[PDB]
Design a protein around this ligand. Structure first.
Ligand SMILES: CCCCCCCCCCCCCCCCCC(=O)OC[C@H](COP(=O)([O-])OCC(O)COP(=O)([O-])OC[C@@H](COC(=O)CCCCCCCCCCCCCCCCC)OC(=O)CCCCCCCCCCCCCCCCC)OC(=O)CCCCCCCCCCCCCCCCC
Ligand SMILES: CCCCCCCCCCCCCCCCCC(=O)OC[C@H](COP(=O)([O-])OCC(O)COP(=O)([O-])OC[C@@H](COC(=O)CCCCCCCCCCCCCCCCC)OC(=O)CCCCCCCCCCCCCCCCC)OC(=O)CCCCCCCCCCCCCCCCC
Ligand SMILES: CCCCCCCCCCCCCCCCCC(=O)OC[C@H](COP(=O)([O-])OCC(O)COP(=O)([O-])OC[C@@H](COC(=O)CCCCCCCCCCCCCCCCC)OC(=O)CCCCCCCCCCCCCCCCC)OC(=O)CCCCCCCCCCCCCCCCC
Ligand SMILES: CCCCCCCCCCCCCCCCCC(=O)OC[C@H](COP(=O)([O-])OCC(O)COP(=O)([O-])OC[C@@H](COC(=O)CCCCCCCCCCCCCCCCC)OC(=O)CCCCCCCCCCCCCCCCC)OC(=O)CCCCCCCCCCCCCCCCC
Ligand SMILES: CCCCCCCCCCCCCCCCCC(=O)OC[C@H](COP(=O)([O-])OCC(O)COP(=O)([O-])OC[C@@H](COC(=O)CCCCCCCCCCCCCCCCC)OC(=O)CCCCCCCCCCCCCCCCC)OC(=O)CCCCCCCCCCCCCCCCC
Ligand SMILES: COC1=C(OC)C(=O)C(C/C=C(\C)CC/C=C(\C)CC/C=C(\C)CC/C=C(\C)CC/C=C(\C)CC/C=C(\C)CC/C=C(/C)CCC=C(C)C)=C(C)C1=O
Lengths: 231, 70, 108, 365, 68, 54, 46
């Protein structure tokens, strides 16, 4: 559709696409023992173990609020690894970062853990909201199954299995019911089912099969436009 | 909608009956008068002042967190 | 000593192995319980966790589980050397010997 | 066979501009009931060339609408009349829609076809849902170099006399007089031999066309007159980045000048990223140009075409209420308020869907 | 006939400005504010406007001095 | 055999944070400020007329 | 409280037109979240 035309878009004074060691005037220079009296530096060799304990904490402190949900603990682990694997899989040469990428990332994860220790990290609150909406939908299915009723998900599967039989009973010249064909059949049903939610199926017409719904409508007397004027 | 609007409705329950059931559906100027002063939920009933506070409160509070978190 | 399990509070139980045969069985049951492990039946005492879909971050989750089942306090300096089933077996023994001789748990 | 159905007829020279009938190919849609699309090809250009574009599974345009690849007067198989007035040529479409029982249609065009399509919306807007113009603009193009060449080639074609000239004499004439490969191929395929091999002739009326172009006045097809007015409905324009017909610098302003609802570049006006090549006018040949045109076309048909002006998209149908002007309704005891405008069925006039659904509604109550 | 739909349009816009002036001003000036001038120009506008208001206030005070 | 399948009982609910709500979100972002802003200036004032007011 | 309807026009069906009936509730839902904060602050203010 549209591609960047400038060939020098990824150029920097430090090279092509260099986001690990941008060029600056005060560049790193070596130190010689025989000539060095004293030095003030914060770099150390403790980042590896801090990278290990930070993982153990962020994992164990997040599981406190999972309520033993095993499927959530395993999902969270996959998400936690995606956060720790950024330096190992990125295009950025994390081993060539200015003053040590190891210390940089470890200090960054420590700020995330601090918020995790208080249960205030946006990833935590997002996991709770996402999970509660998921269980409310799973419990709705359970309540309908205990009553012997059919779920809206099973009705689609059964309606799709029979449509496949109808379409392949006429596909005799060929015998390759491709995954492409199986897909467009399901999407066509989805689009009609998707529109059915807002406009349910009253009669044999089916979901969203009434033209009168699209005639001129008006807000109800009990719910007028609260945000602006109407005329 | 808010509790204060619901209080008006309980107090204006008989007034709502006179204007809406009787007047609003008549013809002539009595109907135009009832349909104009019909009682119910407010069209464009939002309060910009209350909405202004909410916006500036949220915008200024995010500034507090940056300035205080040092 | 209680933890949630599928929304229900359950009392946690700790184990005391004090025997070589019981350790090899616990580690395998532990490693086979991890959802990331591949070829669970091909796993033996001389199995490299790397050959079963496990990386450095998975060894931490396994060690974290050893603390839950045994009550140990494993330091971050010891976790990154646990890359084989044999390593968990020997580390568990070294801890039992340390507490049996020194009367205390190793430095965490 | 089934998907491809082109009615067959013979052109008839007409003295009255109202007794003109249009003929073209019809492409049936995948689904039973779909709105119709009427597409006008470039002048002197074949309708068949657009069939693979509208019958490509990758694009899947027929899933949205039935397509009528229609020929304007003096072109192809349609009737012949010396006048090219866009008002007259627009009335021709309205009779076609009537004879074919089409209440309202989506209009499209390529190049000069886009002008013809937009003119119909300007003269008959209540029966046009939208316009989709490809490498065209409602503008005077008489002095564009690309048009001059087309205007020049048509004049050279008037020199050939099929009765005396032999088949080889023609082929040599085209190669030397026509440098553009595509125009050359287009003109060759427009040559046909009538029944009984009486003689060969062009499918399009070469005489009536050359006079329109050579005269080079307001009635010329290159010209866009102020008489055509304004188009009130939905309009989307797509043209190549480097196009000889529509220059991005200034040839976009006519769209705002003629189309009232055109928002501007990036919403209703797009350019396809491409290189400088005089053949970019024919987007259907190059996959890169076509894939973008198709995607934009499917988006226009799915979300924007046949949608009320003040509504953003089709998503807002039934949930967005338009303000009402005071004293706009006959009922005096009417409490004026916001309303969702009525969107009707695409062929509600020639069917009884409203009468049928009214009965079903009563059965519910 | 006239365009009876435009009746009382000035009164109606006045009441909408009173209801929510910042919203009425915001949307009526949106397309114009898309082209924002420089910080210098914006500052000159504010500076000259507030300075004119400051002198207006001093002239109001000098009138109370003439009344006294 | 597939038709004979059943479904296990899922958990009733996950953790509900006692200090985060949809109207008073605990953490800050420009997204929530945008919602409060457009609620203040109101939605786009769409004109039904054929000419501008001025 | 019940609101008197002049019944000059028929109201849209809630099932077919649901979005039209939502704004009222979310508005009170906002106020309830504010009240939870007013009550939780009884000890801090006191
Ligand atoms: C025997 C003794 C008798 C004693 C009694 C004597 C009394 C005689 C009565 C007989 C006179 C009336 C005759 C009947 C008229 C019928 C005509 C008709 O059909 O309707 C036309 C007229 C048409 O209006 P429309 O078609 O609906 O729409 C208007 C347009 O859309 C235009 O609206 P727009 O939105 O587009 O904006 C433009 C508008 C508004 O433009 C403006 O900006 C003007 C705004 C004026 C008001 C504000 C002034 C500013 C100062 C105040 C600030 C307020 C705003 C502040 C905001 C907040 C600030 C922070 O322009 C107008 O001025 C509209 C006026 C209506 C047109 C008439 C021709 C006017 C031309 C002359 C203009 C100059 C006069 C202005 C008079 C005020 C008009 C409202 O409708 C009427 O107004 C009818 C009025 C008749 C009412 C009679 C009621 C009963 C009278 C008796 C009661 C007792 C009186 C006792 C008096 C005692 C002695 C003092
Ligand atoms: C032209 C150049 C020169 C301009 C010079 C300056 C112009 C005047 C400046 C006045 C500024 C005062 C601001 C007051 C606070 C406003 C704060 C606010 O958040 O605004 C929303 C605020 C509404 O928030 P709300 O309280 O939640 O009410 C919403 C409810 O839903 C409402 O429920 P509802 O929808 O059912 O009600 C219908 C609605 C629509 O109906 C109407 O408003 C139309 C008819 C209203 C009557 C005509 C107004 C006459 C003046 C009012 C009385 C004298 C002053 C009172 C003190 C006002 C100052 C607070 O009514 C309203 O909009 C609100 C009520 C209007 C006030 C009426 C009562 C007045 C007495 C106040 C008693 C309480 C205060 C205690 C006394 C204070 C004195 C010690 O608006 C107002 O309340 C009134 C604002 C008036 C502004 C008019 C002019 C604004 C534009 C000036 C442009 C300046 C040029 C520069 C522009 C540059 C552009 C490029
Ligand atoms: C109740 C109290 C009543 C008394 C007070 C009444 C006050 C009424 C004022 C109401 C507002 C004025 C009308 C504005 C219309 C709406 C905005 C607008 O213009 O549309 C945008 C449109 C273009 O702006 P744009 O589309 O955003 O494009 C700009 C680019 O985005 C980016 O920029 P660019 O790169 O393209 O070019 C650089 C930049 C150039 O930089 C500038 O913008 C120049 C402004 C620098 C600051 C000037 C000082 C601030 C003035 C207000 C404070 C007054 C001080 C006290 C006055 C004491 C003496 C009375 O261009 C601009 O951004 C806009 C300049 C266009 C002129 C703006 C309108 C005139 C200035 C405002 C008039 C103020 C009158 C107040 C008193 C009047 C008393 C009768 O402007 C035009 O309408 C074009 C008109 C042609 C303007 C050029 C020729 C003008 C020659 C006459 C000059 C008159 C000077 C008056 C001096 C006053 C006394 C010292
Ligand atoms: C490590 C390296 C250094 C890193 C430093 C870190 C930098 C961090 C940047 C942080 C950015 C903050 C973002 C938030 C603010 C954004 C909002 C904004 O207003 O930006 C303007 C923003 C962007 O404007 P723009 O059109 O894109 O132009 C951008 C630039 O101006 C460019 O325009 P241009 O391309 O046309 O360039 C021409 C330029 C040409 O300038 C020149 O060629 C030379 C300038 C020579 C200045 C000579 C000064 C002489 C002073 C004499 C005074 C003597 C009196 C002293 C009194 C002593 C008493 C004894 O002239 C100007 O642009 C004038 C701009 C005014 C600048 C005022 C500050 C000047 C010094 C700042 C020093 C900061 C340290 C930098 C060190 C770098 C050293 C290498 O304007 C807006 O449109 C937003 C609304 C603004 C409404 C007006 C009211 C705003 C005031 C409130 C703002 C918010 C609170 C205060 C913030 C600070 C404001 C100063
Ligand atoms: C006791 C009796 C006393 C009371 C008596 C009662 C009288 C009460 C007066 C009320 C009058 C009725 C109120 C009607 C609504 C307000 C007036 C209006 O024109 O609204 C429609 C006007 C546009 O009409 P439209 O057709 O509906 O809009 C179509 C498009 O959407 C618009 O955008 P577009 O680009 O798509 O279409 C074209 C657009 C092209 O033109 C424009 O868009 C204008 C460009 C302006 C935006 C450029 C950026 C500058 C704005 C930045 C924001 C700064 C202010 C906020 C920051 C500080 C916070 C306060 O509009 C035009 O066609 C030309 C503009 C209209 C003619 C020029 C009017 C200039 C003055 C208006 C602004 C007032 C300046 C302050 C003066 C007050 C001094 C204190 O709305 C506005 O542009 C802004 C309205 C803000 C007005 C506030 C002042 C209200 C007082 C009105 C009194 C008359 C003006 C006195 C000033 C005299 C200086 C020469
Ligand atoms: C603490 O952290 C902070 C914030 O939160 C993060 C901030 O937002 C901010 C920014 C501040 C804001 C966004 C607030 C902005 C408010 C400003 C500028 C002032 C607002 C002024 C008004 C809205 C006008 C109010 C006018 C009146 C109340 C007078 C009219 C009402 C009258 C006369 C009623 C009588 C009232 C009383 C007797 C008071 C008793 C109280 C009641 C609630 C009784 C109510 C009774 C009834 C019948 C409703 C800061 C600085 C901050 O520090």
């Amino acid at each position: 559709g549209y591609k960047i035309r400038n060939k020098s878009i990824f150029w920097t004074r430090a090279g092509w696409k260099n986001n690990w060691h941008p060029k600056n005037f005060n560049a790193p220079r070596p130190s010689y023992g025989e000539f060095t009296m004293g030095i003030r530096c914060r770099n150390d060799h403790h980042s590896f173990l801090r990278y290990v304990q930070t993982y153990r904490n962020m994992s164990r402190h997040c599981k406190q609020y999972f309520l033993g949900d095993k499927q959530l603990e395993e999902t969270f682990i996959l998400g936690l690894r995606s956060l720790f694997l950024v330096p190992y899989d990125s295009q950025c040469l994390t081993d060539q970062i200015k003053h040590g990428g190891e210390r940089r990332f470890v200090d960054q994860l420590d700020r995330d853990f601090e918020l995790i220790s208080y249960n205030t990290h946006p990833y935590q609150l997002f996991t709770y909201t996402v999970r509660n909406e998921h269980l409310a939908w799973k419990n709705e299915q359970y309540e309908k199954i205990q009553k012997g009723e059919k779920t809206f998900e099973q009705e689609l599967l059964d309606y799709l299995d029979e449509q496949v039989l109808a379409e392949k009973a006429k596909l005799r010249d060929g015998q390759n019911f491709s995954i492409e064909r199986m897909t467009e059949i399901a999407l066509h049903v989805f689009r009609k089912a998707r529109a059915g939610k807002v406009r349910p199926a009253q009669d044999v017409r089916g979901p969203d099969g009434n033209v009168n719904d699209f005639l001129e409508q008006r807000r109800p007397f009990e719910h007028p436009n609260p945000t602006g004027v109407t005329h | 909608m808010n509790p204060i609007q619901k209080a008006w409705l309980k107090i204006l329950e008989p007034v709502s009956y006179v204007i809406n059931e009787k007047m609003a559906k008549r013809t002539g100027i009595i109907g135009k008068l009832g349909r104009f002063f019909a009682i119910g939920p407010r069209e464009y009933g939002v309060h910009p002042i209350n909405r202004m506070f909410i916006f500036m409160n949220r915008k200024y509070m995010a500034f507090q967190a940056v300035a205080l978190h040092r | 000593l209680t933890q949630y399990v599928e929304g229900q509070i359950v009392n946690r139980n700790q184990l005391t192995l004090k025997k070589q045969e019981d350790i090899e069985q616990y580690v395998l049951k532990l490693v086979r319980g991890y959802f990331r492990t591949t070829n669970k039946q091909g796993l033996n005492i001389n199995s490299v966790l790397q050959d079963h879909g496990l990386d450095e971050f998975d060894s931490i989750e396994l060690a974290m589980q050893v603390e839950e089942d045994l009550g140990y306090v494993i330091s971050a300096e010891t976790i990154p050397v646990l890359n084989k089933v044999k390593h968990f077996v020997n580390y568990i023994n070294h801890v039992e010997q340390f507490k049996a001789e020194n009367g205390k748990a190793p430095i965490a | 066979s089934r998907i491809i159905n082109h009615l067959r007829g013979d052109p008839v020279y007409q003295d009255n501009t109202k007794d003109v009938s249009l003929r073209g190919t019809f492409l049936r849609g995948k689904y039973d009931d779909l709105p119709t699309m009427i597409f006008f090809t470039e002048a002197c250009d074949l309708t068949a060339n657009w069939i693979p574009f509208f019958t490509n599974p990758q694009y899947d345009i027929l899933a949205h609408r039935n397509v009528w690849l229609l020929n304007p007067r003096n072109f192809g198989n349609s009737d012949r009349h010396p006048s090219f007035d866009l008002q007259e040529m627009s009335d021709d479409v309205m009779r076609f829609m009537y004879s074919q029982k089409i209440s309202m249609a989506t209009l499209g065009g390529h190049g000069i076809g886009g002008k013809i399509a937009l003119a119909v919306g300007c003269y008959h807007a209540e029966r046009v849902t939208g316009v989709f113009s490809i490498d065209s603009s409602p503008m005077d193009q008489r002095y564009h170099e690309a048009f001059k060449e087309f205007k020049g080639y048509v004049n050279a074609l008037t020199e050939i006399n099929f009765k005396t000239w032999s088949d080889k004499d023609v082929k040599v004439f085209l190669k030397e007089n026509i440098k553009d490969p595509k125009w050359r191929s287009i003109f060759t395929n427009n040559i046909s031999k009538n029944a009984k091999t009486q003689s060969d002739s062009f499918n399009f009326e070469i005489n009536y066309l050359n006079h329109n172009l050579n005269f080079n006045k307001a009635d010329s097809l290159g010209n866009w007159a102020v008489k055509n007015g304004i188009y009130t409905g939905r309009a989307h324009f797509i043209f190549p980045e480097y196009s000889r017909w529509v220059h991005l610098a200034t040839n976009t302003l006519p769209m705002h000048k003629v189309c009232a609802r055109v928002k501007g570049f990036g919403h209703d006006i797009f350019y396809v990223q491409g290189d400088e090549n005089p053949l970019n006018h024919w987007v259907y040949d190059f996959e890169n140009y076509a894939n973008v045109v198709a995607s934009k076309l499917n988006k226009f048909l799915h979300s924007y075409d046949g949608v009320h002006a003040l509504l953003k998209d089709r998503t807002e149908i039934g949930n967005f209420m338009i303000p009402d002007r005071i004293k706009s309704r006959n009922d005096s005891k009417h409490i004026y308020g916001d309303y969702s405008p009525a969107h009707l069925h695409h062929n509600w006039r020639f069917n009884h869907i409203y009468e049928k659904h009214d009965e079903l509604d009563k059965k519910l109550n | 006939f006239p365009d009876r739909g435009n009746k009382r349009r000035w009164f109606k816009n006045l009441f909408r400005l009173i209801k929510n002036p910042m919203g009425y001003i915001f949307w009526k000036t949106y397309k114009a504010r898309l082209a924002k001038p420089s910080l210098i120009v914006t500052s000159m506008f504010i500076g000259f406007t507030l300075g004119f208001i400051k002198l207006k206030a001093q002239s109001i005070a000098y009138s109370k001095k003439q009344y006294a | 055999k597939e038709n004979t399948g059943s479904m296990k009982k899922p958990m009733a609910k996950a953790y509900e944070h006692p200090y985060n709500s949809e109207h008073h979100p605990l953490n800050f972002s420009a997204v929530k400020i945008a919602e409060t802003f457009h609620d203040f200036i109101g939605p786009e004032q769409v004109s039904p007329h054929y000419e501008s007011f001025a | 409280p019940k609101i008197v309807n002049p019944q000059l026009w028929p109201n849209p069906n809630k099932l077919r037109f649901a979005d039209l009936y939502k704004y009222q509730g979310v508005e009170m839902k906002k106020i309830n979240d504010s009240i939870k904060n007013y009550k939780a602050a009884k000890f801090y203010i006191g």
